[PDB]
Protein backbone atom coordinates (compact mmCIF):
# COMPACT_ATOMS: atom_id res chain seq x y z
CA UNK A 1 0.00 0.00 0.00
CA UNK A 2 1.18 3.53 -0.82
CA UNK A 3 -0.41 5.81 1.79
CA UNK A 4 -1.59 9.37 1.43
CA UNK A 5 -0.08 11.89 3.87
CA UNK A 6 -3.19 12.56 5.96
CA UNK A 7 -4.30 8.93 5.76
CA UNK A 8 -0.98 7.86 7.26
CA UNK A 9 -1.06 10.63 9.89
CA UNK A 10 -4.50 9.45 11.08
CA UNK A 11 -3.41 5.81 11.22
CA UNK A 12 -0.23 6.80 13.11
CA UNK A 13 -2.27 8.87 15.60
CA UNK A 14 -4.73 5.99 16.12
CA UNK A 15 -1.86 3.66 17.14
CA UNK A 16 -0.36 6.19 19.62
CA UNK A 17 2.60 7.83 17.78
CA UNK A 18 1.65 11.49 18.37
CA UNK A 19 4.04 12.69 21.10
CA UNK A 20 5.43 9.17 21.77
CA UNK A 21 8.69 9.75 23.68
CA UNK A 22 8.15 13.49 23.02
CA UNK A 23 8.15 13.25 19.20
CA UNK A 24 5.23 15.11 17.61
CA UNK A 25 3.25 13.41 14.81
CA UNK A 26 4.92 15.47 12.05
CA UNK A 27 8.33 13.94 12.78
CA UNK A 28 7.00 10.41 12.09
CA UNK A 29 5.22 11.38 8.86
CA UNK A 30 8.36 13.20 7.72
CA UNK A 31 10.53 10.12 8.42
CA UNK A 32 8.16 7.80 6.49
CA UNK A 33 8.12 10.06 3.45
CA UNK A 34 11.92 10.08 3.10
CA UNK A 35 12.51 6.47 4.32
CA UNK A 36 9.98 4.74 2.05
CA UNK A 37 7.94 7.30 0.08
CA UNK A 38 4.86 6.20 2.12
CA UNK A 39 5.11 2.65 0.59
CA UNK A 40 4.64 -0.38 2.92
CA UNK A 41 6.35 -2.71 0.45
CA UNK A 42 9.69 -0.82 0.26
CA UNK A 43 12.89 -2.85 0.79
CA UNK A 44 16.54 -1.72 0.64
CA UNK A 45 19.66 -3.89 1.06
CA UNK A 46 22.60 -2.65 3.17
CA UNK A 47 26.30 -3.39 2.55
CA UNK A 48 26.65 -5.68 5.61
CA UNK A 49 24.00 -8.20 4.37
CA UNK A 50 21.04 -6.86 6.37
CA UNK A 51 17.88 -5.43 4.78
CA UNK A 52 15.49 -2.56 5.66
CA UNK A 53 11.71 -3.20 5.43
CA UNK A 54 8.41 -1.29 5.37
CA UNK A 55 7.28 2.31 5.77
CA UNK A 56 9.90 3.00 8.42
CA UNK A 57 12.69 0.84 6.95
CA UNK A 58 13.32 -1.30 10.03
CA UNK A 59 16.58 -3.22 9.84
CA UNK A 60 16.94 -7.07 9.96
CA UNK A 61 20.25 -6.79 11.85
CA UNK A 62 18.50 -6.25 15.21
CA UNK A 63 14.72 -6.07 14.85
CA UNK A 64 13.11 -8.75 12.62
CA UNK A 65 13.84 -12.20 11.10
CA UNK A 66 14.28 -12.60 7.33
CA UNK A 67 16.22 -15.88 7.39
CA UNK A 68 19.25 -14.51 5.56
CA UNK A 69 21.05 -12.23 8.07
CA UNK A 70 23.36 -14.58 10.02
CA UNK A 71 24.08 -13.75 13.66
CA UNK A 72 21.23 -11.25 13.80
CA UNK A 73 18.67 -10.63 16.50
CA UNK A 74 14.91 -10.44 16.25
CA UNK A 75 14.01 -8.03 19.08
CA UNK A 76 10.47 -7.23 17.78
CA UNK A 77 9.82 -11.00 17.49
CA UNK A 78 8.25 -10.83 14.03
CA UNK A 79 9.03 -12.00 10.51
CA UNK A 80 10.44 -9.04 8.51
CA UNK A 81 7.69 -9.70 5.93
CA UNK A 82 5.02 -8.78 8.50
CA UNK A 83 6.50 -5.25 8.22
CA UNK A 84 5.48 -5.08 4.56
CA UNK A 85 1.73 -5.36 5.32
CA UNK A 86 -1.06 -2.89 4.42
CA UNK A 87 -1.79 -2.83 8.17
CA UNK A 88 0.95 -0.76 9.87
CA UNK A 89 0.31 -2.17 13.38
CA UNK A 90 3.49 -4.30 13.46
CA UNK A 91 5.60 -1.46 12.01
CA UNK A 92 4.33 0.97 14.66
CA UNK A 93 4.83 -1.42 17.58
CA UNK A 94 8.41 -2.21 16.49
CA UNK A 95 9.20 1.49 15.97
CA UNK A 96 8.05 2.16 19.58
CA UNK A 97 10.77 -0.23 20.78
CA UNK A 98 13.47 1.36 18.56
CA UNK A 99 12.80 4.99 19.50
CA UNK A 100 12.85 3.90 23.17
CA UNK A 101 16.38 2.44 23.06
CA UNK A 102 18.44 5.55 23.99
CA UNK A 103 19.01 7.02 20.53
CA UNK A 104 15.53 8.48 19.90
CA UNK A 105 14.68 9.12 16.25
CA UNK A 106 18.36 9.43 15.21
CA UNK A 107 18.17 5.71 14.45
CA UNK A 108 16.45 6.82 11.22
CA UNK A 109 19.17 8.41 9.03
CA UNK A 110 16.70 10.21 6.76
CA UNK A 111 14.93 11.77 9.79
CA UNK A 112 18.24 13.10 11.14
CA UNK A 113 19.30 14.62 7.81
CA UNK A 114 15.97 15.84 6.35
CA UNK A 115 13.43 16.33 9.23
CA UNK A 116 15.39 17.18 12.43
CA UNK A 117 15.52 20.98 13.03
CA UNK A 118 12.84 21.75 10.46
CA UNK A 119 9.17 22.74 10.57
CA UNK A 120 7.77 19.18 11.00
CA UNK A 121 4.19 20.48 11.66
CA UNK A 122 3.95 21.29 7.97
CA UNK A 123 3.68 17.50 7.36
CA UNK A 124 0.25 17.30 9.07
CA UNK A 125 -1.07 20.71 7.98
CA UNK A 126 -4.48 20.49 6.31
CA UNK A 127 -5.33 17.07 7.79
CA UNK A 128 -8.49 16.71 9.91
C1 LIG B 1 -1.87 18.38 -4.36
C2 LIG B 1 -0.78 18.64 -5.36
O3 LIG B 1 0.33 19.05 -4.77
C4 LIG B 1 -0.42 17.40 -6.14
N5 LIG B 1 0.69 17.49 -7.04
C6 LIG B 1 0.34 18.42 -8.13
C7 LIG B 1 1.57 19.01 -8.82
N8 LIG B 1 2.51 19.57 -7.84
C9 LIG B 1 2.07 20.91 -7.44
C10 LIG B 1 2.81 21.25 -6.19
O11 LIG B 1 2.90 20.39 -5.29
O12 LIG B 1 3.34 22.38 -6.11
C13 LIG B 1 3.84 19.67 -8.44
C14 LIG B 1 4.62 18.39 -8.23
N15 LIG B 1 4.74 17.94 -6.83
C16 LIG B 1 5.79 18.72 -6.15
C17 LIG B 1 5.79 18.43 -4.67
O18 LIG B 1 4.70 18.35 -4.06
O19 LIG B 1 6.89 18.30 -4.10
C20 LIG B 1 5.19 16.54 -6.87
C21 LIG B 1 4.04 15.58 -7.12
N22 LIG B 1 2.96 15.76 -6.13
C23 LIG B 1 3.30 15.04 -4.89
C24 LIG B 1 2.43 15.58 -3.78
O25 LIG B 1 1.97 16.74 -3.90
O26 LIG B 1 2.22 14.87 -2.79
C27 LIG B 1 1.69 15.20 -6.66
C28 LIG B 1 0.98 16.16 -7.62
C1 LIG C 1 5.09 21.97 -3.95
C2 LIG C 1 4.72 21.73 -2.50
O3 LIG C 1 4.70 20.43 -2.24
C4 LIG C 1 5.71 22.44 -1.60
N5 LIG C 1 6.21 21.85 -0.41
C6 LIG C 1 6.00 22.82 0.68
C7 LIG C 1 4.54 22.84 1.10
N8 LIG C 1 3.95 21.48 1.11
C9 LIG C 1 2.73 21.49 0.29
C10 LIG C 1 2.11 20.12 0.24
O11 LIG C 1 2.86 19.12 0.13
O12 LIG C 1 0.86 20.02 0.32
C13 LIG C 1 3.55 21.10 2.49
C14 LIG C 1 4.69 20.47 3.29
N15 LIG C 1 5.25 19.27 2.65
C16 LIG C 1 4.40 18.08 2.90
C17 LIG C 1 4.69 16.98 1.90
O18 LIG C 1 5.37 17.24 0.88
O19 LIG C 1 4.24 15.84 2.13
C20 LIG C 1 6.59 19.01 3.19
C21 LIG C 1 7.67 19.83 2.49
N22 LIG C 1 7.68 19.69 1.01
C23 LIG C 1 8.38 18.43 0.64
C24 LIG C 1 7.96 17.86 -0.71
O25 LIG C 1 7.12 18.47 -1.41
O26 LIG C 1 8.46 16.76 -1.06
C27 LIG C 1 8.39 20.87 0.46
C28 LIG C 1 7.64 21.60 -0.65
GD1 LIG D 1 5.31 19.36 0.15
- CA dist 96 and 75 (Å) reads 12
Technique used to solve these coordinates = X-ray
Q: Residue of the nearest CA to atom 11 in ligand 2? A: 123
Distance CA 11, CA 31 (A): 15
Q: How far is CA 73 from CA 7, 50, 52, 69, in A?
A: 32, 11, 14, 9
- Pinpoint the alpha helices (H) of the chain: 5-14, 25-36, 89-99, 109-114
Structural domain range at position 11: 1-128
Domains identified in the chain, total number: 1
Nearest Cα to Cα of residue 54 among 76, 37, 77, 71:
37
| Alpha-carbon span 69 to 3, nearest angstrom | 29
Q: What CATH number did the domain enclosing 4 receive?
A: 1.10.530.10
Given the CA of residue 29, which atom of ligand 2 is nearest to it? Answer: 19
Cα of 5 vs centre of ligand 3, distance in Å, is: 10
Burial of 56 (0-12, 13-18, 19+ CB in 10 A): buried
87 annotated ligand-binding residue: no
Rounded Cα–Cα distance for residues 125 and 127 (Å): 6
* Closest of 34, 36, 15 to residue 90, by C-alpha: 15
Q: Which residues contact 121 (CB under 8 A, 6 or more apart)?
A: 24, 26
> 8 near 38, Cβ under 8 Å?
yes
Looking at the CA of residue 5, tell me the nearest atom of ligand 2. Answer: 19
Nearest CA to ligand 2 atom 17: 123
Q: In angstroms, what is the resolution? A: 2.1
CA of 123 to the centre of ligand 2 (A): 8
The DSSP string of 101-120 is SSSGGGGSHHHHHHTTTS-G
Task: State yes or no: is 87 an active-site residue.
Answer: no
- Is 103 in contact with 95 (CB distance < 8 Å)? no
Q: Are strands 51-53 and 43-45 parallel, antiparallel or unpaired?
A: antiparallel
Number of H helices, E strands in the chain: 4, 3
First CA to last CA distance, the chain: 21
Amino acid sequence: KVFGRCELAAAMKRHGLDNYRGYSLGNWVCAAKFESNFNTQATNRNTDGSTDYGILQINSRWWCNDGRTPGSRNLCNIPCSALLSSDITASVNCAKKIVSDGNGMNAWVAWRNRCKGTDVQAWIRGCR
